[PDB]
Amino acid sequence: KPYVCERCGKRFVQSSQLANHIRHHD
Ligand SMILES: [Zn+2]
Known part of the structure; x- marks a missing residue:
């Protein structure tokens, strides 16, 4: 899944979890 935290470089299997x-960076 192409869902990675642009803000700290951590990614997630779930788009929901990445968001x-x-x-938490907002
Ligand atoms: Zn992050």
């Missing part, structure tokens, strides 16, 4: 991840 959840980056939501």
Whole structure:
């Protein structure tokens, strides 16, 4: 899955979790 945190370089299998991840960078 091409879903990686542009903000810290961590990626996720789930698009939801990646957005959840980056939501914590908001
Ligand atoms: Zn991140």
